Write a protein that binds this ligand. Structure first.
Ligand SMILES: *[C@@H]1O[C@H](CO)[C@@H](O)[C@H](O)[C@H]1NC(C)=O
Ligand SMILES: *[C@@H]1O[C@H](CO)[C@@H](O)[C@H](O)[C@H]1NC(C)=O
Ligand SMILES: *[C@@H]1O[C@H](CO)[C@@H](O)[C@H](O)[C@H]1NC(C)=O
Ligand SMILES: *[C@@H]1O[C@H](CO)[C@@H](O)[C@H](O)[C@H]1NC(C)=O
Ligand SMILES: *[C@@H]1O[C@H](CO)[C@@H](O)[C@H](O)[C@H]1NC(C)=O
Ligand SMILES: *[C@@H]1O[C@H](CO)[C@@H](O)[C@H](O)[C@H]1NC(C)=O
Ligand SMILES: *[C@@H]1O[C@H](CO)[C@@H](O)[C@H](O)[C@H]1NC(C)=O
Ligand SMILES: [Zn+2]
Lengths: 182, 213, 922
């Protein structure tokens, strides 16, 4: 019999296994930070890999990529002033950037509708064919080293279940009603 | 006079992580002072940092309390700890060096995928297209259809329709197979696997023939 | 050594194993001391009998059906000796802690002429104790001080009483020392000093300052050393007894695990326990924490005194109960921390802070209200856990606990609380002229425990070996499957111009052409990933439900959403492709609209009868499309019988019956499947397992839980007899009767019995706490604190599933029974399967017991939820940032499914054609 095994393939790669998330590294000689997106849509620098800095890179058009914060459920969007933030809703006119690798091996992302380079700093400059890049604009995709167990936020807050009272007749909670009837 | 070693300019030590691509120069400086002259040692992940460990060597500048690398390699990744001490007192600081080994390239497609298949009518067809690219590629499945009489539009290009295109909530490994259940004579034609990252493009095509039982 | 206890909170921050959190087995080390406590002013009474003087409490109660709560008679133990010793006979106890009344033995504060009558009372008691075999533990000072020593020297604020308490301690060592070999000098000096003189909430006091309290405790700590050295070089070489001091303390937990909170917790224990424990077991000096904040009002110990107090205790007498815990503990001394009644780590903290001493718990147990009589389940479960954590301190921590003493042999005067609180194991009727002891439920529990010395292994809780029947349904539940209405391929109908040459991009045309093909199953790119998770799970049956509000949005069956119907079709067909039988439900009580379409819910929902008819037509639609692939259906999916009303439950039974008859008369001959309800069947157990009233309120609660909807369908075709009886007797007969047509329609509408069990609850008849008491059913809902709980406080009771299986068989005969849902949420949010793996390993085994040891015709087990994406915490797969990872429960459940039960080392891989109709074959 001929049988059908398969075709050549080399299985997954950079991440934990198929955790294809990467952290965007940035270095400006003096300092060094990672691109982080908080739960409220604030972008700042994280010196080490955090859960809010985990980004998923997924290309869309012919050469354009999509940067999504996998923990905050927010997309990286740029406005007309050049700022960047996080929005829970996708928009191909603002939350879409073009990627290109320079000669020094660093990746640069800029908006096709605003020409502003995605920069961690306040230097929201345009792009030039190999002139002077603004600071905090040259990124480097670094593999993820965080286990996927820490990527789900907890929930048992429950502030003041019964306060202190200093007279609790049932401290070990032996009496537990179940909320019945209506 | 009996002063303990201290950090003179701590503003030069805020960069904790040093991640540079292959063949790059890194500079680890630990400015310090004291009376008399203190020593400056380096530890590679808690071991001896001898110039015979790495190929090419380095250059330690004692005037700036720094060390200069030359074409870093992935073997040089780890933690570098500088130690300063003279009398009674030993301050130390640990940096982290990472070597990001990456090389951009056009999307590579496995030769032979998709392949021409013919399983008559009513059977199930599934084409495959193995894609790999570093800047993450985009996948589209196109079908060369015919509009009106012919099948070539303006200039000299064929008419195609979007069968399956990756989007936001799209698995990177689900765009590798194009499923065709039952199929019909309308599906007979040419199927193309268009893949492209941010450098160039790559595509393989395969014809589908539908016979009869 | 001081400071070695700060490591306790660190070692208790990580749970070691789930078997240690329960530890429902194990016996105490041989030689353990079982005791029961008592006092003088609590039980003796007779403040002016046989020439007795007057204590400080005798004057406090007299001068603030009478109005002032006094202890003149109380339990009246001075005139009832045989009455009190018979209780010790029945308890099987080995020791008995009672106290001597100072004002009774020495009515004159000068050690003048001892009272021969008062001494005769304690001599008679000790004589009978010798005949019974009860070794006494005598407390010399138990908060009773003569009034003569108060108006002459100023009470304990004078150091001159160190010799007075020496004389009173001398004759007690002389007379009764030949029989007593366990002496306690001072019982809880903390409350005597602090609340005695500084606060004034006890017998004396005038509210002066804490300085008076610290000075009184200073003299108290000196008098104890005087008495201990009086016993060491005068009575020990000729008697051999041990002398200690009963020290009480609380337990505290930190706020945010910070070093500040932990250091403030250590400061709280050093302020309450170390106040007296360190100057006795360590170096004779006060703890360093108290030396800082009390650098003025705290008295100073001379160097000669520190060595005189150091080492004056042959063992550690621990007091831990409702004495100061959540009562008399000063709030400021907590230092902004949380007060906890945790006895386990307190034993471990004392074990480390005092160089592994011998711990003898001289007082424990909790309390109940003054109206609670002989049924005191609250107290017996507090006592149950109090001894449970002590056993854990011996087996797992290494603490050298040497004895246990459940406090209060009988009810009596509870100091400032008067008689409004009861703590004894024997009920006393103060209004009666007999006041005889009546054994409570806790007294029977303590008796049965001493007879076995702890918790020996019981045969009911033993692992069971054996396999489940062949073709036993194994699978998971998913009550809220994420719908995927968006198709993956063949969606774009426009045509493009592919510039194959030059730039290889697409250019859309401004025209319209081509069409759309029929959508197949591969278009839904959400079925195959879920099926891929079910294949490696070795699940043979997948249970899920349908969204009625989405199938028929406009209520009526005219505007049908065929898209999600194709989604459900492919969901079932692809399951049969991989040999996984789908079990589909129709309605669920989720959503804010009772799981109903918005129009049906806005028009009365289940209160309106037409909803039942609309359900049957909706059922027929589901039977027409999905009926080709689905072979196991469910009408209602765990309706909240505790939340619905009778008007809604009546129409709900109509809806289920109508759907069952639609399938039976129109779809059964063409579809070899079965339809039934799925009822939530939490088990209910009587708090006191021997009380009749607790058993009948357990049955009543079980009738409102399960019988409400099971009896009209599986049983007599009517509502439960107990439910109708309790409602008619309550004159609130708001329960509708079943007409002949309704009874003929609903009764018999079942092909199997789908059970849903999660936990078991405890029920008690007596109103323990009014604000937590169910008035509609007259039941106090409780729980055994010894059971392993979840972060959501859900009890883990493996045998309760076996109990509810036997109850359904007894109530409705032999019948094919499914376990439609059974699971437990995550734990610790890091090691979630430390609790779930132990949950399933036992809950499934106890189910196998019912099949073999009880003859239950079990047909399938369904673990509750297989992902946290749809149902958080309860899933078997973890969902963290668009990634499903299998937990350890997946590999453990797969191990059970592959082994088909819990097989041992006859060994048969039986493929019996098809048996007992628990399921079918492809
Ligand atoms: C002893 O106490 C009694 C109280 O019953 C009192 O009458 C008597 O005077 C006292 N005697 C002395 C010497 O204090
Ligand atoms: C207690 O008595 C023993 C004699 O049995 C003696 O050796 C010891 O020194 C005494 N303790 C003190 C503190 O004097
Ligand atoms: C220290 O003592 C003062 C007054 O004696 C008191 O107000 C303060 O609460 C004490 N410190 C703590 C931590 O309780
Ligand atoms: C739509 O449903 C309502 C009840 O919810 C019913 O009264 C009405 O006749 C229905 N209309 C159609 C066209 O089915
Ligand atoms: C069916 O419901 C889905 C929402 O779950 C909606 O997207 C779709 O348009 C509906 N189809 C019809 C025909 O109403
Ligand atoms: C289902 O079982 C049959 C035989 O019982 C087997 O031939 C078939 O391969 C199974 N399906 C899968 C997906 O393995
Ligand atoms: C109980 O029923 C009422 C009315 O049917 C509803 O509003 C409520 O959400 C239900 N649940 C609880 C816990 O009260
Ligand atoms: Zn009871």
């Amino acid at each position: 019999d001929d049988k059908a095994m398969g075709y050549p393939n080399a299985s997954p790669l950079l991440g934990s296994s198929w955790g294809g998330l990467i952290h965007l590294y940035t270095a400006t000689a003096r300092n060094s930070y990672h691109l982080q997106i908080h739960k409220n849509g604030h972008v700042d620098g994280a010196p080490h890999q955090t859960i809010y800095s985990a980004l998923m890179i997924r290309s869309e058009d012919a050469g354009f990529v999509v940067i999504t914060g996998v923990m905050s459920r927010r997309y990286l969007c740029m406005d007309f002033r050049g700022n960047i933030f996080g929005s829970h809703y996708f928009d191909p006119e603002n939350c879409r950037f073009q990627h290109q690798t320079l000669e020094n091996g660093y990746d640069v992302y800029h908006s096709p509708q605003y020409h502003f380079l995605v920069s961690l700093g306040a230097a929201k400059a345009a792009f030039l064919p190999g002139m002077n890049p603004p600071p905090y604009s040259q990124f480097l995709s670094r593999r993820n080293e965080i286990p996927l167990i820490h990527f789900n936020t907890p929930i048992p807050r429950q502030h003041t279940q019964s306060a202190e009272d200093d007279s609790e007749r049932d401290p070990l909670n032996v009496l537990k009603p179940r909320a019945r009837m209506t | 006079m009996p002063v303990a070693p201290y950090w003179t300019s701590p503003e030069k030590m805020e960069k904790k992580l040093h991640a540079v691509p292959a063949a790059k120069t890194v500079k680890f400086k630990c400015p310090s002072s004291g009376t008399p002259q203190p020593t400056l040692r380096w530890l590679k992940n808690g071991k001896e940092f001898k110039p015979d460990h790495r190929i090419g060597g380095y250059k330690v500048r004692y005037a700036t309390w720094s060390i200069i690398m030359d074409s870093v390699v992935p073997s040089d990744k780890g933690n570098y700890t500088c130690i300063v001490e003279n009398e009674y007192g030993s301050i130390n600081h640990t940096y982290q060096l990472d070597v990001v080994e990456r090389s951009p390239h056009r999307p590579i497609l496995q030769a032979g995928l998709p392949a021409n298949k013919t399983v008559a009518l009513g059977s199930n067809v599934e084409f495959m297209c193995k894609v790999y690219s570093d800047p993450q590629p985009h996948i589209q499945w196109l079908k060369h259809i015919e509009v009106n009489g012919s099948k070539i539009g303006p200039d000299n290009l064929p008419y195609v329709q979007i069968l399956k295109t990756a989007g936001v909530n799209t698995t990177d490994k689900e765009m590798e197979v194009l499923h065709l259940r039952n199929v019909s004579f309308e599906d007979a034609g040419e199927y193309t696997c268009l893949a492209g990252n941010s450098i160039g493009l790559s595509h393989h095509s395969a014809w589908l023939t539908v016979l009869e039982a | 050594e001081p400071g070695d206890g700060a490591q306790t909170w660190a070692r208790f921050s990580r749970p070691p194993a789930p078997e240690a959190a329960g530890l429902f087995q194990g016996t105490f080390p041989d030689g353990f001391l079982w005791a029961v406590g008592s006092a003088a002013y609590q039980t003796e009474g007779g403040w002016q009998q046989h020439g007795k003087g007057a204590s400080i409490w005798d004057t406090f109660t007299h001068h603030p059906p009478l109005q002032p709560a006094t202890g003149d008679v109380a339990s009246d133990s001075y005139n009832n000796v045989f009455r009190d010793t018979e209780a010790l006979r029945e308890l099987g106890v080995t020791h008995y802690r009672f106290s001597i009344s100072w004002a009774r033995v020495l009515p004159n504060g000068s050690a003048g002429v001892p009272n021969r009558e008062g001494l005769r009372y304690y001599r008679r008691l000790l004589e009978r104790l010798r005949e019974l075999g009860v070794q006494p533990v005598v407390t010399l000072y138990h908060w009773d001080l003569p009034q003569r020593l108060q108006d002459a020297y100023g009470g304990w604020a004078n150091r001159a009483l160190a010799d007075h308490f020496r004389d009173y301690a001398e004759l007690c060592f002389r007379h009764f020392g030949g029989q007593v070999k366990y002496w306690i000098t001072i019982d809880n000096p903390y409350v005597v000093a602090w609340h005695g003189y500084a606060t004034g909430r006890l017998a004396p006091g005038i509210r002066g300052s804490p300085r008076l309290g610290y000075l009184v405790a200073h003299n108290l700590l000196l008098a104890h050393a005087k008495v201990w050295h009086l016993y060491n070089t005068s009575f020990r070489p000729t008697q051999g007894g041990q002398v200690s001091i009963a020290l009480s303390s609380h337990w505290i937990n930190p706020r945010r695990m910070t070093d500040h909170s932990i250091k403030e917790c250590q400061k709280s224990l050093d302020f309450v326990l170390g106040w007296f424990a360190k100057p006795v077991f360590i170096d004779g000096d006060y703890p360093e924490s108290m030396k800082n904040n009390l650098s003025s009002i705290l008295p100073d110990f001379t160097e000669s005194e520190k060595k005189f107090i150091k080492g004056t205790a042959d063992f550690f007498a621990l007091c831990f109960g409702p004495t100061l815990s959540f009562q008399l503990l000063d709030p400021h001394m907590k230092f902004r921390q949380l007060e906890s009644p945790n006895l386990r780590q307190l034993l471990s903290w004392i074990d480390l802070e005092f160089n592994h001493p011998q711990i003898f718990i001289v007082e424990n147990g909790w309390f109940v209200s003054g109206t609670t009589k002989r049924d005191d389940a609250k107290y017996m479960y507090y006592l149950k856990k109090f001894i449970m954590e002590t056993l854990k301190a011996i087996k797992l921590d290494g603490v050298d606990v040497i004895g246990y003493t459940a406090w209060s042999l009988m009810d009596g005067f509870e100091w400032h609380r008067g008689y409004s609180i009861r703590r004894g194991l024997f009920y006393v009727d103060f209004l009666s002229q007999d006041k005889m002891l009546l054994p409570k439920s806790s007294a029977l529990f303590y008796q049965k425990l001493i007879e076995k010395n702890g918790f020996p292994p019981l045969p009911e809780n033993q692992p069971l070996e054996g396999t489940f029947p062949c073709d036993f349904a194994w699978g998971v539940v998913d009550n809220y499957i994420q719908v995927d209405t968006t198709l993956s391929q063949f969606t774009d109908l426009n045509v493009y111009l592919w510039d194959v040459h030059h730039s290889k991009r697409l250019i859309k045309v401004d025209g319209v052409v081509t069409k759309k093909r029929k959508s197949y199953c591969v278009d839904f790119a959400a079925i195959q990933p879920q099926i891929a998770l079910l294949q490696e799970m070795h699940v043979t049956h997948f249970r899920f439900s349908l969204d009625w509000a989405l199938i028929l949005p406009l209520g009526n069956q005219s505007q049908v959403n065929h898209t999600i119907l194709q989604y459900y079709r492919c969901m079932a067909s692809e399951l049969v492709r991989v040999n996984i039988t789908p079990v589909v439900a129709l309605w669920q009580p989720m959503a804010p609209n009772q799981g109903l379409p918005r129009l049906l819910a806005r028009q009365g929902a289940w209160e309106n009868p037409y909803t039942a008819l609309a359900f049957a037509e909706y059922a027929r639609l589901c039977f027409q499309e999905l009926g080709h692939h689905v072979k196991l259906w469910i009408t209602m999916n765990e309706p909240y019988t505790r939340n619905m009303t009778y008007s809604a439950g009546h129409n709900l039974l109509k809806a289920h019956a109508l759907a069952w008859h639609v399938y039976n008369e129109k779809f059964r001959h063409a579809q070899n499947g079965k339809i039934s309800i799925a009822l939530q069947a939490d088990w209910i157990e009587p708090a006191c397992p021997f009380s009749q009233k607790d058993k009948e309120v357990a049955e009543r609660v079980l009738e409102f839980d399960i019988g409400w909807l099971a009896e009209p369908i599986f049983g007599s075709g009517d509502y439960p007899w107990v439910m109708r009886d309790w409602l008619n007797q309550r004159n609130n007969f708001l329960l509708p009767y079943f007409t002949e047509d309704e009874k003929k329609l609903i009764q018999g509408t079942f092909d199997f019995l789908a059970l849903s069990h999660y936990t078991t609850i405890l029920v008690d008849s007596e109103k323990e706490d009014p604000i937590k008491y169910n008035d509609y059913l007259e039941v106090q809902e409780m729980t055994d604190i010894t059971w392993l709980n979840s972060p959501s406080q859900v009890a883990v009771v493996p045998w309760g599933l076996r109990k509810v299986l036997n109850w359904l068989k007894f109530k409705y005969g032999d019948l094919p029974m499914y376990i439609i849902s059974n699971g437990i949420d995550d734990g610790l949010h890091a090691e979630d399967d430390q609790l779930r793996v132990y949950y399933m390993q036992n809950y499934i085994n106890e189910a196998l017991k019912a099949h073999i040891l009880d003859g239950i015709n079990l047909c399938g087990y369904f673990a509750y939820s297989f992902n946290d994406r749809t149902a958080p915490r309860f899933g078997l797969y973890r969902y963290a940032a668009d990634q499903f990872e299998p937990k350890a429960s997946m590999k453990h459940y797969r191990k059970i499914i592959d082994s088909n039960g819990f097989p041992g080392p006859r060994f048969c891989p039986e493929e019996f054609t098809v048996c007992t109709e628990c399921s079918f074959f492809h």
